Enzyme design. Structure first.
Site, PDB file in Angstrom:
ATOM      1  N   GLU A  48       1.029  -1.186   0.084  1.00 17.18           N
ATOM      2  CA  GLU A  48      -0.056   0.040  -0.111  1.00 17.18           C
ATOM      3  C   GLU A  48       0.854   1.119  -0.044  1.00 17.18           C
ATOM      4  O   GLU A  48       0.735   2.212  -0.525  1.00 17.18           O
ATOM      5  CB  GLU A  48      -1.007  -0.080   1.294  1.00 17.18           C
ATOM      6  N   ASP A  70      -7.351   3.418  -0.530  1.00 19.60           N
ATOM      7  CA  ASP A  70      -7.948   2.737   0.619  1.00 19.60           C
ATOM      8  C   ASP A  70      -7.304   1.956   1.514  1.00 19.60           C
ATOM      9  O   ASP A  70      -6.833   0.843   1.103  1.00 19.60           O
ATOM     10  CB  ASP A  70      -9.169   1.860   0.034  1.00 19.60           C
ATOM     11  N   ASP A 134      -6.321  -2.264  -8.019  1.00 17.83           N
ATOM     12  CA  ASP A 134      -6.579  -3.253  -7.326  1.00 17.83           C
ATOM     13  C   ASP A 134      -6.140  -4.508  -8.286  1.00 17.83           C
ATOM     14  O   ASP A 134      -5.333  -5.403  -7.782  1.00 17.83           O
ATOM     15  CB  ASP A 134      -7.678  -3.366  -6.833  1.00 17.83           C
TER      16      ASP A 134
END
Length: 151
Positions: A48, A70, A134
């Site tokens: 991330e 996110d 993603d």
């Protein structure tokens, strides 16, 4: 007016720890640049962070950046923990370095080069660019080519 750039990120691993990857999209004047890479073994949280690092470092000049991600870890780190990590010399209770200090510092270094505006996403639903990141991350994690030397 300073250059305005949009950055979307996402990172993930197959299992945790495990093969991982990051996916990021950089948009400027409509143009979209894609970034992605997979590592043999890393963690969800490191990916991330890596996604944001890679995208930001691609900026050759100072910009106003709108970062959309996110990540509870990144959000908590940037909005709360980081202030205390700095106050404590980046060392935790066992007197050892904070986890992922290498990437946290690299990200802070990149952040300080621009005017950042974080937009924390709660579920990729309704956020196409983030969904694309993603899939980009998962695809890389399934075909790794790098080693996360920091891990």
């Amino acid at each position: 007016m300073l250059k305005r750039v949009e950055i979307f990120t996402d990172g993930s691993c197959l299992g945790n720890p495990g093969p991982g990857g990051y996916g990021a999209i950089l948009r400027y004047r409509g143009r979209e640049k894609t970034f992605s890479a997979g590592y043999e073994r890393t963690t969800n949280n490191r990916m991330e962070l890596m996604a944001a690092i890679v995208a930001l470092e691609a900026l050759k000049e100072h910009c106003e950046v709108i970062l959309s991600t996110d990540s509870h870890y990144v959000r908590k780190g940037i909005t709360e923990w980081i202030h205390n990590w700095k106050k404590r010399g980046w060392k935790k209770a066992d007197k050892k370095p904070v986890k992922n200090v290498d990437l946290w510092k690299r990200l802070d270094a990149a952040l300080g080069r621009h005017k950042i505006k974080w937009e924390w996403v709660k579920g990729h639903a309704g956020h196409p660019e983030n969904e694309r990141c993603d899939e980009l991350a998962r695809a890389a994690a399934m075909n790794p080519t790098l080693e996360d030397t920091g891990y």
